[PDB]
Subunit: 88 residues, 3 copies
C-alpha cells in the first residue's frame, strides 16, 4: 500500500539521519583527542629544542557539536511529521 511504504521510507531516512548525527559526534571525539596529543607533542618539541604553531580546532569542534545537535533535532521533527502521516 502506497502510504505505508511512504511512512516506512521516511522512517528509514530518519534512521540514516540519526546514524549521521552519531557519526559526527564520534568524529568530534576523535578530533578532540588528536588536538590534545598533537599539542602535547608540540609543547615537548619546543621544550626540547630550547633546552638545546599549535593546533586550535576549537571553532570546528563547536560547529560540529552544533551540527550533532541540529541533526538530532531534525530527527525529532521528522518523527512528528511521520506521526502526522500515520494519522491521516
Amino acid at each position: 500500500k502506497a502510504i505505508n511504504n511512504i511512512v516506512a521510507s521516511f522512517s528509514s531516512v530518519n534512521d540514516a539521519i540519526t546514524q549521521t548525527a552519531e557519526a559526527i559526534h564520534t568524529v568530534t571525539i576523535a578530533l578532540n583527542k588528536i588536538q590534545d596529543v598533537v599539542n602535547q607533542q608540540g609543547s615537548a618539541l619546543n621544550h626540547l629544542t630550547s633546552q638545546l604553531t599549535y593546533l586550535n580546532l576549537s571553532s570546528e569542534l563547536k560547529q560540529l557539536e552544533a551540527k550533532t545537535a541540529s541533526l538530532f533535532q531534525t530527527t525529532v521533527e521528522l518523527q512528528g511529521l511521520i506521526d502526522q502521516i500515520n494519522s491521516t
Copy 2:
C-alpha cells in the same frame, strides 16, 4: 505525483550513499593521522630518552559501524522506493 515522490526518495537515498562514503573517507583520514602522530610521539620519546599514545581505535570502529549501517539503510530504502514505484 507518485513519480516525484519516488524521485525525491531516490534523491535522498543518493545523499545517504554520499554520506556513508564521506564517513568512510574521514575514517581513512583519521587512521592515517593516528599512524603519523604516533610515529612522531615515538621519535620524540626516543630523542628525549637520549608522551601519550594517540588511541582512536574505538572511534574508527564506531565510524566503520556507521558506514556499514548507512549502506544497509540504502538497500532497505531502495527496496521501499521500488515498492512505491510498483504501486498499481
Copy 3:
C-alpha cells in the same frame, strides 16, 4: 492532509542533508589544519635529529571530502526542485 505532511517531511530531510554537507565541510577544514601542524612538527623533528619521518598525506582524502561536500549540496538543490514539483502537482 497526507501530501502536505509529505512535502514538510521532504523539506525536513533536505535540511538534514544541508547540515550534513556543512558538517563534512567543517571536518575537511579540521583535517587540513591537523595535516598542516603535524607536518610542521615532523619537519621540525627531522631537522633537529639531523642537526643532532613520514609526511602525513591527506590530499586524496581532502579532495574526496570536497567532492562530497559539493555533491551533497547539489542534491539539496535537486531535491528542492522535486519538492517544488510535488507542491505544484
